[PDB]
Amino acid sequence: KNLGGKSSGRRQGIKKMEGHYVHAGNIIATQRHFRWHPGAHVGVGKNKCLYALEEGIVRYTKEVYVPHPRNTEAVDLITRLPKGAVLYKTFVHVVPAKPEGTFKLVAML
Amino acid sequence: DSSRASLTRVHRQAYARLYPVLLVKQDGSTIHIRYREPRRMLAMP
Amino acid sequence: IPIEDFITPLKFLDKARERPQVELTFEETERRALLLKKWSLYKQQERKMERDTIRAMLEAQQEALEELQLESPKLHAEAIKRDPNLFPFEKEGPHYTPPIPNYQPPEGRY
Amino acid sequence: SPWRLLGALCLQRPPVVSKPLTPLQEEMASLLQQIEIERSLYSDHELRALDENQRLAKKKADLAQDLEDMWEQKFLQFKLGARITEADEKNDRTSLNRKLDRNLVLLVREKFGDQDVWILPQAEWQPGETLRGTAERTLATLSENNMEAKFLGNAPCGHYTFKFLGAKVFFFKALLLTGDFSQAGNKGHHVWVTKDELGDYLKPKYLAQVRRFVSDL
Amino acid sequence: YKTKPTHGIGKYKHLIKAEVRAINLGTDYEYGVLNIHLTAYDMTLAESYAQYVHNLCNSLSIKVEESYAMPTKTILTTHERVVQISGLSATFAEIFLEIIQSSLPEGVRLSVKEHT
RNA sequence: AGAGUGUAGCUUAAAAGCACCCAACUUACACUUAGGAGAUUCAAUUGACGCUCUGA
Ligand SMILES: [Mg+2]
Ligand SMILES: [Mg+2]
């Protein structure tokens, strides 16, 4: 009677952990729902994947969730909280290692 | 302080003129009630 | 059963031409706008009076059940109780004239 | 401790006549008509007064004013009862129509063995009767009438204690719906007092502060 | 993570209450639901006094569930509005009632009728 | 008479920030947007105008 349910595992979760060196475009963590939210130099795909935007070192932190005011679901969850309540979510950052370029001497004109 | 919620305004948008018509219920109870075609003296037995 | 009278009447649409003239001068708008500010300070004062008589009387009434707590431990456990007589409560507001002389009580009612 | 047991009651007469307006409020009133008139939508009184007279001008170039004349005469016919039944008497301090706009409270004279104190209505009590029952009994001992007073709860309102042997007075709140105050010129000294004369009849520090828990309006 | 001291830093449903008779148990005595009927023949006088008791309750942290109205009766239509109140303490009961008494504008009648 | 003392309603704010009032959208509340009123109790850390209490 119970047919179906033979789905394989998604193999989602963190691909690059804390402190790992990560180039631009490396997928940091694939997820199904928003477990980790993006932070500094980390983008989101259509399927909620977290890819890195700069070359750097991955850091996981906890900061205050302030949703967008057009996101009417979370704002209506924000305005039911008591007066001292602060939400938190785990954010994933990339601390950019290299600078974006130097000034090199080309030619003495 | 029976003048708190009597300084009013019809808070609708489609409403006609409403005249401060004085009404008496049965016994000499003169009460201002907004009512059309201003009578200024209304009564019921 | 959800039936109400908030519905706008159908007759209040068609003949909307009776006042196409909404104009004031400068000084009539000036004296009205001074009135809205002086009434904004006025009701702030009137609700400042009621925030006194609510707070100060509650101060006396909580100190009363503090005084009736210490000096009679069997009588402040009964002043908390509720009278069953406020269930059919009703009170008319005030008027202009306390009622009348005898009579004359007349309208044809139809 | 030796407790002289005293329960008491301030009655609150509800004002039957609403207060007159203030010079800013009548401007706040007359402004509130003019914006309401400007935002109204074609009443049938102005339909049969403005649209008709154009057409009544039309048959004459080739009535509603008589209606409004009938409404001024009856407004002046049936004359109004007095909002002020106070400026005529001015000395009948026992009257239930002493002040119609304000909050009135019973206040009588009592005489003690050591004191001669104008008093708010008191009574001795016993722990056999409930405290809401003592204030129920105060309605028909010193007043001698058939009033209908209404209490709200069982909690007190004002507590000032004085000692000689100890004593406490407990001020409760009621409200008259009606009143059959028979023989209003009684042998007592009952005065209905708004607020300012409560600082005139009750001098000492356990009686000059009854005004802190009566409604200020 | 579970094994870290920052476990449960982002949980929030214990801060949201997502989902009546007269409650006089041992000392903490409070009413059930109340209804406040205000009938007057002015829509201006009934709508504006329905606001003030709601503004009086909000300034005293008294829970107002509904503030609806029942329809009119053609006598001339009498407009009636219901203001639902829950929860008064012993000291609050006489004081919260007497201010709505001491603010009734012009010939509107109160009610502390109850549900159903 | 004595003690505690004292910034608008509150402030381990130092002339502040929240509370607060009206108007318009809202049945209403709420939100928002337009506006509104505000104080260091006076005199040189000190002394005496005001409030709270313990007394007669
Ligand atoms: Mg599976
Ligand atoms: Mg499988």
XYZ file of C-alpha atoms (C1' of nucleotides) and ligand atoms in Angstrom:
655
model
C 0.000 0.000 0.000
C 2.959 2.269 0.791
C 4.508 2.753 -2.622
C 7.036 5.419 -3.453
C 9.663 6.810 -1.157
C 12.653 5.249 -2.921
C 14.288 8.640 -3.400
C 18.041 8.775 -2.954
C 19.860 11.239 -0.755
C 20.420 14.745 -2.075
C 24.075 14.895 -0.895
C 23.501 18.431 0.327
C 25.208 20.161 3.231
C 28.497 21.944 3.711
C 31.111 21.392 1.026
C 33.660 23.886 2.406
C 33.799 24.098 6.185
C 35.192 26.710 8.557
C 38.586 28.114 7.679
C 38.864 26.498 4.261
C 40.478 28.374 1.410
C 37.866 28.903 -1.267
C 38.149 30.414 -4.738
C 35.467 32.446 -6.464
C 32.546 30.327 -7.585
C 33.139 27.416 -5.220
C 29.884 26.109 -3.822
C 30.194 26.399 -0.061
C 27.022 24.663 1.124
C 24.071 23.193 -0.758
C 20.816 23.186 1.170
C 17.143 22.311 0.824
C 15.742 25.008 3.107
C 17.531 28.057 4.486
C 19.757 26.524 7.115
C 22.706 28.848 6.473
C 22.107 32.302 5.067
C 24.676 34.135 2.931
C 26.995 36.730 4.352
C 29.921 38.773 3.097
C 30.993 37.785 -0.433
C 28.640 34.774 -0.557
C 25.789 34.530 -3.050
C 22.617 32.468 -3.395
C 21.538 30.480 -6.421
C 18.034 29.639 -7.518
C 18.137 26.407 -5.490
C 19.340 28.136 -2.283
C 22.935 26.983 -2.794
C 25.683 29.146 -1.308
C 28.559 29.906 -3.658
C 31.520 32.139 -2.948
C 32.131 35.404 -4.741
C 35.737 36.161 -3.773
C 38.862 34.170 -3.113
C 39.172 33.725 0.607
C 38.572 31.855 3.850
C 35.138 30.643 4.921
C 33.826 31.814 8.299
C 30.557 30.859 9.972
C 29.038 33.452 12.304
C 25.762 34.243 14.050
C 24.148 37.618 13.408
C 20.846 39.378 13.654
C 18.185 38.457 11.111
C 16.566 41.578 9.689
C 14.414 40.410 6.757
C 13.388 42.539 3.831
C 10.203 44.601 4.370
C 8.741 43.227 1.136
C 9.121 39.704 2.575
C 5.676 39.819 4.159
C 5.913 36.388 5.796
C 8.960 37.121 7.928
C 7.891 40.693 8.697
C 4.616 39.343 10.079
C 6.783 36.986 12.166
C 8.949 39.901 13.265
C 5.994 41.969 14.451
C 4.688 39.201 16.723
C 7.898 38.987 18.777
C 8.105 40.539 22.259
C 9.852 43.876 22.693
C 13.323 42.615 23.583
C 13.377 39.740 21.120
C 16.145 39.525 18.524
C 16.305 36.791 15.897
C 19.580 35.180 14.852
C 20.659 33.123 11.860
C 23.909 31.421 10.960
C 25.685 33.371 8.230
C 28.495 32.213 5.944
C 31.165 34.725 5.007
C 34.247 34.690 2.837
C 37.113 36.769 4.220
C 38.872 37.901 1.024
C 42.553 37.022 1.090
C 44.172 38.761 -1.869
C 43.798 42.458 -2.636
C 42.126 43.314 -5.916
C 45.394 44.342 -7.581
C 48.518 46.442 -7.162
C 49.993 49.395 -9.045
C 52.922 48.145 -11.114
C 55.496 50.307 -12.868
C 54.856 50.008 -16.588
C 57.365 52.313 -18.262
C 59.240 55.547 -17.580
C 57.911 57.932 -20.196
C -16.065 65.574 30.636
C -18.994 64.298 28.578
C -17.459 66.117 25.590
C -14.738 63.545 24.845
C -16.234 61.485 22.021
C -18.944 63.934 20.940
C -16.714 66.288 18.962
C -17.114 64.084 15.898
C -17.286 63.734 12.109
C -18.962 61.228 9.813
C -15.940 59.087 8.953
C -17.587 57.707 5.805
C -17.181 58.876 2.202
C -20.675 58.427 0.726
C -22.901 60.188 3.240
C -25.504 62.947 2.901
C -25.936 66.110 4.975
C -26.555 65.349 8.645
C -28.255 68.146 10.635
C -28.016 68.469 14.466
C -31.647 67.556 15.113
C -32.691 67.837 18.757
C -34.649 64.768 19.881
C -36.817 64.134 22.932
C -37.530 60.500 23.739
C -40.708 60.708 25.872
C -40.136 62.906 28.918
C -38.089 66.020 28.170
C -34.713 64.492 27.301
C -33.336 66.905 24.723
C -30.521 65.087 22.898
C -28.785 66.288 19.746
C -28.854 63.587 17.062
C -27.731 64.043 13.460
C -30.796 63.537 11.267
C -31.831 64.550 7.758
C -34.323 67.342 6.865
C -33.615 69.476 9.985
C -36.594 69.403 12.321
C -34.827 70.844 15.450
C -37.645 69.334 17.567
C -38.347 65.599 17.529
C -40.536 63.562 19.851
C -42.141 60.114 20.473
C -45.097 59.401 22.821
C -25.173 35.527 11.137
C -23.065 38.137 9.282
C -25.464 40.906 8.199
C -24.517 44.564 8.734
C -25.223 48.143 7.671
C -21.705 49.258 6.688
C -22.734 48.976 3.019
C -22.677 52.306 1.192
C -26.088 53.185 -0.291
C -26.542 52.839 -4.046
C -28.194 56.277 -4.284
C -24.986 57.998 -3.153
C -23.282 57.716 -6.550
C -25.145 59.366 -9.389
C -25.714 63.058 -8.614
C -22.200 63.859 -7.375
C -22.191 67.412 -8.763
C -23.576 69.392 -5.808
C -20.217 70.713 -4.540
C -17.518 70.867 -7.222
C -16.264 73.942 -5.319
C -13.692 73.113 -2.629
C -11.701 76.332 -2.159
C -10.526 78.396 0.780
C -8.361 81.480 1.039
C -5.034 81.690 2.855
C -6.253 83.115 6.160
C -9.156 80.680 6.579
C -6.680 77.840 6.147
C -4.356 79.617 8.601
C -6.938 79.950 11.366
C -8.102 76.349 10.935
C -4.533 75.041 11.046
C -3.889 76.980 14.241
C -7.037 75.355 15.649
C -5.824 71.817 14.912
C -2.606 72.510 16.824
C -4.371 74.144 19.778
C -6.745 71.187 19.904
C -3.770 68.824 19.688
C -2.409 70.410 22.860
C -5.879 70.454 24.409
C -6.663 66.732 24.301
C -3.090 66.040 25.405
C -3.966 67.993 28.546
C -7.328 66.269 29.019
C -5.820 62.800 28.780
C -3.067 64.013 31.109
C -5.805 64.632 33.657
C -7.234 61.130 33.290
C -3.779 59.562 33.469
C -3.501 61.260 36.861
C -6.855 60.169 38.306
C -6.353 56.611 37.089
C -2.809 56.350 38.457
C -3.297 58.240 41.732
C -6.528 56.436 42.642
C -4.930 53.081 41.770
C -2.097 54.129 44.079
C -4.638 54.727 46.853
C -6.624 51.585 46.044
C -3.545 49.328 46.014
C -2.409 50.911 49.275
C -5.939 50.306 50.578
C -5.651 46.576 49.879
C -2.169 46.888 51.384
C -3.652 48.413 54.546
C -6.567 45.973 54.592
C -4.023 43.181 54.051
C -1.893 43.863 57.131
C -4.584 44.898 59.596
C -7.125 42.153 58.731
C -5.852 38.949 57.092
C -9.346 37.448 56.868
C -10.894 40.474 55.128
C -8.467 41.218 52.279
C -8.989 37.709 50.944
C -12.640 38.643 50.442
C -12.335 42.162 49.015
C -10.728 40.582 45.955
C -13.980 38.713 45.177
C -16.336 39.753 42.401
C -19.929 40.810 42.828
C -22.326 38.789 40.644
C -24.514 41.876 40.076
C -22.622 43.538 37.202
C -23.710 40.977 34.598
C -26.896 42.965 33.544
C -25.124 46.325 33.834
C -26.464 49.336 31.881
C -26.268 53.091 32.417
C -27.584 56.006 30.362
C -25.405 59.019 29.653
C -26.188 62.645 30.452
C -28.612 65.082 28.842
C -29.469 68.785 28.614
C -32.598 68.986 30.770
C -33.610 66.823 33.703
C -36.839 65.582 32.318
C -39.834 67.948 32.576
C -43.132 68.868 34.094
C -45.953 66.285 34.010
C -46.908 65.569 30.435
C -47.742 66.329 26.753
C -46.017 63.292 25.562
C -47.221 63.505 21.934
C -46.274 62.157 18.520
C -48.412 60.204 16.044
C -45.503 57.725 15.580
C -46.466 56.906 11.963
C -4.690 45.396 68.837
C -7.803 47.297 69.921
C -9.434 48.205 66.609
C -12.343 50.604 66.523
C -14.067 49.252 63.432
C -15.387 51.881 61.008
C -16.689 51.337 57.494
C -17.796 54.203 55.327
C -19.076 55.209 51.907
C -18.819 58.094 49.474
C -21.817 57.958 47.148
C -21.358 59.251 43.605
C -24.282 60.996 41.978
C -23.800 60.721 38.208
C -24.314 64.071 36.459
C -27.530 64.091 34.464
C -26.585 67.107 32.315
C -23.501 67.202 30.090
C -20.999 70.001 30.643
C -21.031 73.189 28.551
C -18.336 73.469 25.923
C -15.115 75.477 26.008
C -14.286 78.480 23.723
C -11.800 76.414 21.712
C -14.181 73.457 21.414
C -17.021 75.501 19.905
C -14.539 76.587 17.255
C -13.540 72.918 17.118
C -17.245 72.150 16.792
C -18.038 74.741 14.111
C -14.978 73.699 12.121
C -16.152 70.086 12.337
C -19.480 70.986 10.718
C -17.899 72.875 7.817
C -15.552 70.071 6.763
C -18.445 67.604 7.152
C -20.680 69.733 4.920
C -17.900 69.983 2.338
C -17.526 66.175 2.293
C -21.249 65.297 2.266
C -23.016 63.925 -0.815
C -26.253 65.578 -2.079
C -28.859 65.248 0.680
C -32.498 65.274 -0.390
C -33.111 68.478 1.580
C -30.835 70.461 -0.759
C -32.141 68.483 -3.734
C -35.652 69.757 -3.052
C -34.499 73.313 -2.278
C -31.965 74.071 -5.015
C -33.076 71.894 -7.954
C -36.735 72.873 -7.508
C -36.163 76.646 -7.416
C -34.350 76.516 -10.761
C -37.425 74.773 -12.211
C -39.796 77.062 -10.287
C -37.819 79.860 -11.951
C -38.359 78.044 -15.258
C -42.181 78.072 -15.213
C -42.163 81.784 -14.351
C -39.592 82.847 -16.971
C -41.652 81.184 -19.722
C -41.660 75.119 -2.273
C -39.204 74.166 0.472
C -38.889 77.527 2.262
C -42.380 77.074 3.720
C -41.270 73.740 5.193
C -38.313 75.223 7.088
C -40.587 77.906 8.545
C -42.593 75.176 10.308
C -39.430 73.878 11.969
C -38.352 77.177 13.522
C -41.691 77.796 15.220
C -41.913 74.462 17.070
C -38.282 74.817 18.173
C -39.323 78.093 19.778
C -42.735 76.749 20.874
C -41.812 73.934 23.257
C -39.476 75.744 25.606
C -36.450 74.050 27.121
C -36.022 72.797 30.651
C -33.437 74.647 32.703
C -29.871 73.420 32.357
C -29.223 75.678 35.363
C -31.600 74.967 38.230
C -28.752 76.236 40.437
C -28.520 80.044 40.022
C -32.087 80.401 41.315
C -31.627 78.433 44.552
C -27.901 78.939 45.430
C -28.498 77.967 49.090
C -30.402 74.650 48.837
C -27.339 72.541 49.480
C -29.538 69.572 50.436
C -31.076 69.338 46.955
C -30.494 66.472 44.547
C -30.592 69.149 41.823
C -27.823 71.114 43.564
C -25.465 70.719 40.577
C -26.505 68.958 37.379
C -23.200 69.101 35.474
C -20.884 67.750 38.161
C -20.226 64.766 40.412
C -22.037 65.024 43.747
C -21.308 63.196 46.995
C -23.235 62.841 50.262
C -21.609 64.702 53.145
C -23.245 65.159 56.560
C -22.441 66.382 60.056
C -21.734 64.012 62.930
C -20.873 64.824 66.539
C -18.573 62.763 68.745
C -17.742 62.709 72.432
C -14.502 64.598 71.802
C -14.872 65.822 68.199
C -17.349 67.929 66.201
C -16.457 66.853 62.673
C -18.259 67.344 59.382
C -18.029 63.831 58.056
C -18.289 61.527 55.051
C -21.023 58.894 55.845
C -19.644 56.250 58.215
C -20.855 53.212 60.165
C -19.493 50.804 62.765
C -18.970 47.216 61.685
C -18.562 43.685 63.120
C -16.617 40.836 61.405
C -19.871 38.824 61.188
C -21.071 41.045 58.351
C -19.108 41.391 55.123
C -17.497 44.701 54.193
C -19.573 45.028 51.022
C -22.511 44.420 53.376
C -21.623 47.336 55.671
C -21.703 49.748 52.741
C -24.998 48.131 51.752
C -26.358 49.091 55.177
C -25.168 52.710 55.004
C -27.757 53.436 52.287
C -30.710 53.259 54.686
C -29.642 54.311 58.203
C -28.641 57.977 58.089
C -30.345 58.752 54.774
C -33.818 57.376 55.730
C -35.074 56.899 52.168
C -35.689 54.412 49.337
C -32.622 54.990 47.153
C -31.167 52.581 44.592
C -27.370 52.654 44.921
C -25.013 50.580 42.783
C -21.666 49.190 43.908
C -19.204 47.790 41.388
C -16.784 45.605 43.360
C -15.677 44.654 46.853
C -12.340 46.457 46.846
C -11.946 49.659 48.894
C -10.971 53.012 47.471
C -9.417 55.113 50.246
C -7.760 54.287 53.553
C -6.879 56.917 56.151
C -6.263 55.667 59.683
C -6.275 57.731 62.867
C -5.746 56.617 66.450
C -6.831 57.959 69.821
C -6.824 52.321 70.983
C -6.772 52.195 67.180
C -9.192 52.830 64.331
C -9.425 52.736 60.536
C -12.033 54.184 58.160
C -12.708 52.492 54.808
C -14.168 54.596 51.988
C -16.175 52.619 49.422
C -17.796 53.752 46.158
C -21.420 53.506 45.015
C -23.629 55.255 42.458
C -27.323 56.153 42.560
C -29.436 55.000 39.638
C -32.469 56.864 40.992
C -33.499 58.030 44.434
C -36.639 58.309 46.545
C -35.049 60.734 49.008
C -38.116 61.293 51.151
C -37.991 64.306 53.512
C -35.019 65.983 51.854
C -35.129 68.627 54.568
C -34.131 66.039 57.161
C -32.834 66.718 60.663
C -29.288 66.104 59.392
C -26.809 68.252 57.497
C -26.440 66.550 54.123
C -24.653 68.618 51.458
C -24.013 67.546 47.873
C -20.556 68.955 47.111
C -18.681 68.870 43.814
C -14.914 69.267 44.486
C -13.875 72.701 45.715
C -16.125 72.735 48.798
C -14.721 69.335 49.858
C -11.655 71.372 50.760
C -13.980 73.649 52.726
C -15.898 71.246 55.011
C -13.263 68.554 55.716
C -10.130 70.247 57.079
C -7.700 67.711 58.689
C -5.108 65.612 56.911
C -7.140 62.411 57.116
C -10.149 64.209 55.583
C -8.706 66.893 53.271
C -7.571 64.191 50.824
C -10.883 62.507 49.955
C -10.616 64.292 46.593
C -7.746 62.046 45.496
C -10.059 59.119 44.654
C -13.265 60.810 43.459
C -13.500 61.326 39.685
C -12.150 64.687 38.581
C -13.946 65.069 35.174
C 25.402 23.035 16.130
C 24.155 20.867 18.961
C 27.484 20.232 20.694
C 28.476 23.888 20.647
C 27.571 26.594 23.177
C 25.718 28.470 20.414
C 23.024 25.793 20.205
C 19.550 27.223 19.978
C 20.685 30.778 19.350
C 18.336 31.020 16.385
C 15.200 29.429 17.776
C 12.103 31.594 17.853
C 8.823 29.658 18.111
C 8.923 29.862 21.899
C 8.465 33.629 21.472
C 5.271 33.205 19.409
C 1.946 31.911 20.764
C 0.824 30.332 17.493
C -2.326 28.240 17.800
C -13.801 31.095 28.287
C -15.466 31.320 31.702
C -14.989 33.539 34.771
C -11.506 32.863 36.139
C -11.590 33.336 39.933
C -9.346 30.536 41.185
C -7.743 31.248 44.555
C -6.762 34.919 44.733
C -6.152 36.050 41.130
C -9.781 36.730 40.279
C -10.602 37.911 36.780
C -13.617 38.032 34.503
C -14.187 36.021 31.372
C -14.970 37.659 28.090
C -17.046 40.816 28.370
C -19.140 42.629 25.813
C -19.735 46.376 25.881
C -22.876 47.353 24.000
C -23.182 51.019 23.099
C -26.411 52.017 21.377
C -27.094 55.467 19.978
C -28.977 56.906 17.029
C -25.884 58.767 15.807
C -23.332 56.840 13.778
C -20.921 59.643 14.674
C -21.517 59.233 18.402
C -21.371 55.436 18.366
C -18.296 54.975 16.167
C -16.305 57.597 18.056
C -17.039 56.220 21.511
C -16.162 52.734 20.291
C -12.660 54.081 19.644
C -12.118 55.623 23.067
C -12.838 52.534 25.166
C -10.537 50.672 22.778
C -7.954 53.409 23.324
C -8.587 53.212 27.066
C -8.023 49.447 27.072
C -4.859 49.602 24.943
C -3.398 52.118 27.409
C -4.087 49.703 30.296
C -3.069 46.371 28.635
C -6.548 44.827 28.589
C -7.089 42.254 25.855
C -9.711 43.235 23.276
C -10.696 40.310 21.054
C -13.490 41.696 18.877
C -14.818 45.180 18.318
C -17.625 44.391 15.883
C -21.188 45.704 15.606
C -24.719 44.350 15.422
C -26.999 45.822 12.719
C -29.559 48.568 13.137
C -33.309 48.571 13.771
C -35.585 50.921 11.823
C -37.532 52.744 14.528
C -34.514 56.282 12.686
C -31.884 53.557 13.079
C -30.228 52.746 16.401
C -26.552 51.918 15.869
C -25.121 49.366 18.301
C -21.450 48.433 18.697
C -19.897 45.639 20.751
C -16.482 45.935 22.421
C -15.151 42.617 23.717
C -13.058 42.811 26.904
C -11.249 40.065 28.799
C -9.448 40.245 32.110
C -9.852 42.689 34.979
C -8.216 42.532 38.398
C -9.933 43.391 41.686
C -8.573 46.934 41.790
C -9.105 47.349 38.041
C -12.806 46.419 38.072
C -14.279 49.541 39.671
C -11.720 51.919 38.180
C -11.911 50.740 34.559
C -15.702 50.806 34.674
C -16.061 54.260 36.244
C -14.011 56.087 33.606
C -16.221 54.782 30.787
C -19.053 56.022 32.991
C -17.297 59.361 33.424
C -16.871 59.866 29.668
C -20.286 58.955 28.182
C -20.876 61.810 25.718
C -24.609 62.373 25.109
C -27.279 59.833 26.028
C -25.450 56.660 24.992
C -26.098 53.650 27.198
C -23.438 51.245 28.443
C -23.564 47.474 28.869
C -21.405 44.850 30.571
C -23.464 42.068 28.997
C -21.634 38.845 28.209
C -21.230 36.255 25.467
C -23.971 34.339 23.586
C 9.402 68.036 64.013
C 12.958 64.528 61.616
C 14.808 61.194 57.426
C 14.909 60.179 52.113
C 15.614 63.343 48.639
C 14.362 66.116 43.203
C 16.079 65.892 34.662
C 8.975 66.384 30.760
C 6.004 59.827 32.300
C 10.611 56.566 32.833
C 15.991 56.578 32.412
C 24.118 53.126 36.073
C 20.863 59.982 28.590
C 24.482 63.719 29.056
C 19.481 69.284 27.217
C 19.139 62.941 24.617
C 16.246 58.405 23.469
C 11.822 56.096 24.214
C 6.996 56.391 26.117
C 2.762 60.554 24.971
C -1.398 63.924 21.911
C -4.254 65.164 17.332
C -5.398 64.619 11.990
C -5.829 61.301 7.386
C -6.054 55.416 5.525
C -8.443 51.983 8.427
C -15.623 49.240 11.509
C -11.725 49.872 15.156
C -6.965 48.762 17.130
C -2.274 48.374 14.852
C 1.098 50.035 11.180
C 2.496 54.200 8.389
C 2.500 59.385 6.976
C 1.706 64.411 8.226
C 1.830 67.702 12.726
C 1.982 68.803 18.331
C 3.525 69.799 23.585
C 7.329 69.137 26.537
C 11.784 69.385 31.615
C 17.592 69.652 35.099
C 13.567 73.592 41.997
C 15.996 78.524 42.539
C 20.981 80.539 44.731
C 27.014 79.615 45.539
C 30.719 70.051 44.695
C 27.592 73.150 48.635
C 23.050 75.831 50.973
C 17.503 77.072 51.249
C 11.644 75.914 47.122
C 8.884 71.205 46.341
C 7.559 65.868 47.025
C 7.641 60.965 49.756
C 7.670 58.968 54.717
C 8.186 58.376 60.184
C 5.442 61.819 64.475
C 2.493 65.026 67.528
Mg 13.500 8.649 1.786
Mg 18.010 4.402 -2.098
